[PDB]
Design an enzyme around this catalytic site. Structure first.
Site, PDB file in Angstrom:
ATOM      1  N   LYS A   1     -15.804  11.161  62.856  1.00  0.00           N
ATOM      2  CA  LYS A   1     -16.549  12.279  62.457  1.00  0.00           C
ATOM      3  C   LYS A   1     -15.955  12.975  61.437  1.00  0.00           C
ATOM      4  O   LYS A   1     -16.596  13.759  60.999  1.00  0.00           O
ATOM      5  CB  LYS A   1     -16.950  12.902  63.813  1.00  0.00           C
ATOM      6  CG  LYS A   1     -18.452  13.496  63.524  1.00  0.00           C
ATOM      7  CD  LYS A   1     -18.812  14.686  63.947  1.00  0.00           C
ATOM      8  CE  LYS A   1     -20.398  15.116  64.006  1.00  0.00           C
ATOM      9  NZ  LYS A   1     -20.964  14.463  62.639  1.00  0.00           N
TER      10      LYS A   1
ATOM     11  N   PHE B   1      -7.732  21.671  71.385  1.00  0.00           N
ATOM     12  CA  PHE B   1      -8.192  21.009  72.838  1.00  0.00           C
ATOM     13  C   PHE B   1      -8.458  19.439  72.541  1.00  0.00           C
ATOM     14  O   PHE B   1      -9.040  19.447  71.521  1.00  0.00           O
ATOM     15  CB  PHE B   1      -9.438  21.973  73.433  1.00  0.00           C
ATOM     16  CG  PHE B   1      -9.472  21.573  74.710  1.00  0.00           C
ATOM     17  CD1 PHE B   1      -9.143  22.558  75.768  1.00  0.00           C
ATOM     18  CD2 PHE B   1     -10.062  20.573  75.355  1.00  0.00           C
ATOM     19  CE1 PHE B   1      -9.261  22.394  77.056  1.00  0.00           C
ATOM     20  CE2 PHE B   1     -10.081  20.132  76.837  1.00  0.00           C
ATOM     21  CZ  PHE B   1      -9.828  21.286  77.611  1.00  0.00           C
TER      22      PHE B   1
ATOM     23  N   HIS C   1     -20.014  24.761  81.232  1.00  0.00           N
ATOM     24  CA  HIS C   1     -19.123  25.479  80.290  1.00  0.00           C
ATOM     25  C   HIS C   1     -19.300  24.740  78.482  1.00  0.00           C
ATOM     26  O   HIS C   1     -19.233  25.408  77.823  1.00  0.00           O
ATOM     27  CB  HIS C   1     -17.858  25.285  80.500  1.00  0.00           C
ATOM     28  CG  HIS C   1     -16.682  26.372  79.975  1.00  0.00           C
ATOM     29  ND1 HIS C   1     -16.922  27.841  80.341  1.00  0.00           N
ATOM     30  CD2 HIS C   1     -15.894  26.314  79.344  1.00  0.00           C
ATOM     31  CE1 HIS C   1     -15.948  28.365  79.736  1.00  0.00           C
ATOM     32  NE2 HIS C   1     -15.448  27.741  78.914  1.00  0.00           N
TER      33      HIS C   1
ATOM     34  N   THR D   1     -19.057  21.654  84.579  1.00  0.00           N
ATOM     35  CA  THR D   1     -19.723  22.774  84.511  1.00  0.00           C
ATOM     36  C   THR D   1     -20.430  22.898  83.237  1.00  0.00           C
ATOM     37  O   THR D   1     -20.312  21.726  82.346  1.00  0.00           O
ATOM     38  CB  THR D   1     -18.736  23.987  84.654  1.00  0.00           C
ATOM     39  OG1 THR D   1     -18.231  24.472  83.596  1.00  0.00           O
ATOM     40  CG2 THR D   1     -17.663  23.882  85.943  1.00  0.00           C
TER      41      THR D   1
END
Ligand SMILES: O=c1[nH]c(NC[C@H](O)[C@H](O)[C@H](O)CO)c(CCCCCP(=O)(O)O)c(=O)[nH]1
Ligand SMILES: O=c1[nH]c(NC[C@H](O)[C@H](O)[C@H](O)CO)c(CCCCCP(=O)(O)O)c(=O)[nH]1
Ligand SMILES: O=c1[nH]c(NC[C@H](O)[C@H](O)[C@H](O)CO)c(CCCCCP(=O)(O)O)c(=O)[nH]1
Ligand SMILES: O=c1[nH]c(NC[C@H](O)[C@H](O)[C@H](O)CO)c(CCCCCP(=O)(O)O)c(=O)[nH]1
Ligand SMILES: O=c1[nH]c(NC[C@H](O)[C@H](O)[C@H](O)CO)c(CCCCCP(=O)(O)O)c(=O)[nH]1
Ligand SMILES: O=c1[nH]c(NC[C@H](O)[C@H](O)[C@H](O)CO)c(CCCCCP(=O)(O)O)c(=O)[nH]1
Ligand SMILES: O=c1[nH]c(NC[C@H](O)[C@H](O)[C@H](O)CO)c(CCCCCP(=O)(O)O)c(=O)[nH]1
Lengths: 154, 154, 154, 154, 154, 154, 154
Positions: free
Chosen positions: B135, B22, B88, B86
């Protein structure tokens, strides 16, 4: 009534300190405070084991190794978290605190919390040897008390 | 005082990287950074095992398998979470961070956190090889240090 | 570099789906998406086991039973949570996500997250086969990938 | 496709109910609803075991004892939390929900959630046998379904 | 394609550090970071030459002497400039940066920039071992890379 | 680690001071401070060579002659620039600072910066022996240190 | 360098505490803290001499008598001043602090300051065993340190 408590003289006590390097200019002051608290309460500096790790995230796994040592009476976790622009702070702060507390219960040994979790740089400076004291000193003092307490309680 | 620390030369170290798909246009940059950090610190690219998974949600279960390998010295978790409309994001971010930290304590092996948890796309880009660094590089560097530390601590 | 990844052909894979009934008009669309994803990726519908439960709260305990089956390669959790007037949503959403993630780590088997956690009805509709896609399809696709990955990783 | 589901006739099923006393004027209505749901679905009132505890905080430890009984098919947790002036509500609500969910997974037995977690008194009244129904009835009905499901799934 | 790059292991490398005393409470943290970076990357502290000067203004002339040493592989310039009420900051910052860059080109040797040029005290603290890292560490790391690069490029 | 630094006793040191006449009511205070600093640190006033020039613009060419003297250990540039209505200040301030810095690098000899570059008259008074100290004293002290440092570094 | 400092173990030390009665509900907590600090640092409660006086105004004259005792190693002054409607607070606070400091210098013996001087009741409660700690504990701890220091310094 049975009463159990720990005194604050640290003679013969042996401590583990796990200190992260992120925000080291502040962490370093917390480490100074923890050691000074131990030594001037009667503990020997030779009885201190200091472990350095990159960030607060890594503190629990190292503390887990120190706490398992039979000749460590208590572990002092030292770090400095300062909130940035993202929620990242929340997740690291949550996991460091949960890991340390969980390890203490699993290993039945005191692990004290000297991790600053500040919203701002100013708050962190305040708690690292300026106007609001030194969180390392506080966590060291707690560790002395808990180690003593555990001599009769554990 | 006994002092334990990890150095940053990665010679002979073996790393697991678990990277989600993702937000891959950003994850991919984190992966480039982690590998580069390892290699230019002396680690061999052949000593890296890369596991891909669909999303941050799936990172822990894969990391759990990598961390259990006797010939993996540390695992680097890489992913990019960006908040949507949301809640989520909150639940996935909470579970990925908790799972990784829990696995590290249970397996007594370093698992470093290279998962971006950003409120905005911009924040994510900043932390994936632009103005706020990379990161993946940060988490790799932490893993190098922790693996070295664990050579004497574990 | 060793590289592990899962492909997306589902031939021979066997899946558990745990689907709650609260908000069924939406859950039912998620279930349709998950099955369709499996079948059109080559999985047989006969290799799907569907378990129904009352609400998202009950999803983990049922998933725990499915995930323990030796002949289930991955479990897909499907549900729809929509925030109401109280904090109730928060506590159910927190526990469903934590339970599923914990079970996956404990049983060392993929359990994917196809639970919508929406603030509004509209957000839920968007994610249940309308403008933002179908969260069941997404979680099924993840389960296919993870099951394949686990054929070499586990 | 294999399909598992629980029906809603409660003949022969045996239930544990753990009900707290804080906010009893409301809890008592939840208890009435849960029992009525069980009885009018065919369950015998004699097959119900009711345990009372002081507050929602104490519900998990008692439920843990009930759920371990071989002759209890499911446990129904009933309580009423209403937010006050402090964060206290948050910590109790968080721990009651986590404990119940954790026990259900550990004991591999359904424990349903009939604990109201309301911001206001009005919200609590709404959900305790007035305009938004009866949370005890809802959790009982869920327990009936789950117990039946578990006759073939467990 | 011919590719030249520097690795980050510092074994056998010899570094010059020129550090000013104005704002020493911050400079000192930069110096700690630079040394630590060198040492933990494999460099020997004995191979570090540290030169102190009064202010950033004086850094170039001292760096010019260090950079001319045949046994110095790279020089790291460390200082802290914080803007006051006048344009003075501008003229010192301009001349320190120009001098260092000019010396590097004239002597064909890397001289890295670890001079903070901040508008506020807070910005300076952020960059001296707190929330934005440690500019000394950054400049040391750059010097390691450049010295290595120059082993094949120069 | 090799450490080089300059002490602040000025015995045997010989200094050049170049002082402009524009804004002399202030420059004169800077000159008093520089001489006093030298003398009370052990330097002999007879070892000071003072050169006067019209304005800050002319300081570099005169300093260039002083710095080339084999028996001058360091040069102290003293002047007072105060911004007027035009950009003229910017161009003179830029050229005086660049010339001095360039001469120091070319002649490999310390030339310290005691030129006030103020926006207002008040700022200039503040820095010429009032509330913000004396910039001549500061630049003299820097010259003492640099001359000493250069006894071992140059 | 010669270094003198006091440690914090109170074995064999003998303390005078002078505690006023105005605002006793708070003073009493300060007295509890001071005694606890002494005892748990190894001091014997029997070695504490407690003198009560009406108000902060009267603290100095009583402390003057305690401090003159050859067998008192340090005196701890405890009181609570809270500003009212008039300037009265200022004059009492000024005289109590000046008297104690003067006595310490005249008698060449430590007298520590555990007198709260608060603008509000809330501030006083904060400093008397709530969120800002316990001023009696602080002043006791100081007295332990000073008494130890004075064993080598005096
Ligand atoms: O101790 C720490 N650590 C830390 N991050 C590093 C982290 O702990 C790990 O070392 C890293 O994630 C690799 O595992 C930080 C930074 C947290 C704030 C991030 C800012 P952002 O949200 O703007 O990105 C800290 O303040 N204190
Ligand atoms: O790594 C990830 N994953 C992810 N979602 C996918 C998830 O991790 C699982 O793969 C999926 O749930 C199947 O298990 C996302 C999206 C999270 C934000 C959702 C937006 P919404 O709230 O608008 O629906 C991410 O940003 N980073
Ligand atoms: O999957 C679910 N479940 C659910 N509640 C039922 C719950 O999951 C259990 O079945 C029930 O608590 C019995 O255990 C809900 C409703 C949650 C929001 C409650 C609204 P309120 O805060 O206004 O009361 C949902 O949206 N999705
Ligand atoms: O079931 C409960 N319990 C409860 N508190 C009691 C608690 O559960 C324990 O019984 C008690 O803490 C002793 O363990 C409360 C009160 C919670 C809100 C506190 C209000 P406050 O924040 O204003 O103090 C409730 O609403 N429902
Ligand atoms: O490294 C430095 N140096 C410095 N000034 C001293 C200067 O570098 C020379 O040492 C001095 O001019 C003598 O040559 C300063 C102060 C610069 C800001 C001046 C404030 P002002 O404009 O209010 O007068 C600094 O922040 N960092
Ligand atoms: O040392 C100096 N010199 C100076 N101007 C004179 C200049 O240095 C030369 O002497 C002149 O230009 C001839 O070469 C000035 C005046 C500069 C500001 C000019 C004001 P204006 O912009 O209003 O014309 C000063 O403040 N300090
Ligand atoms: O320790 C003390 N003492 C005290 N007043 C009493 C005083 O110390 C003497 O005992 C009294 O004056 C007799 O000598 C006070 C009250 C001071 C504030 C007076 C309020 P007012 O200005 O509204 O009149 C106190 O807060 N703490």
């Amino acid at each position: 009534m049975q009463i159990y408590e720990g005194k604050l003289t640290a003679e013969g006590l042996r401590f583990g300190i796990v200190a992260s390097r992120f925000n080291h200019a502040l962490v370093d002051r917390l480490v100074e405070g923890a050691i000074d608290c131990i030594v001037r309460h009667g503990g020997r500096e030779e009885d201190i084991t200091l472990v350095r790790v990159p960030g607060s995230w890594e503190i629990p796994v190292a503390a887990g190794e120190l706490a398992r040592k039979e000749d460590i009476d208590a572990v002092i976790a030292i770090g400095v978290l300062i909130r940035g622009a993202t929620p990242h702070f929340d997740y690291i702060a949550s996991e460091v605190s949960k890991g340390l507390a969980n390890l203490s219960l699993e290993l039945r040994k005191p692990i004290t919390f000297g991790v600053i979790t500040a919203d701002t740089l100013e708050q962190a400076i305040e708690r690292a040897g300026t106007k609001h004291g030194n969180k390392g000193w506080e966590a060291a003092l707690s560790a002395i008390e808990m180690a003593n307490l555990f001599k009769s309680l554990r």
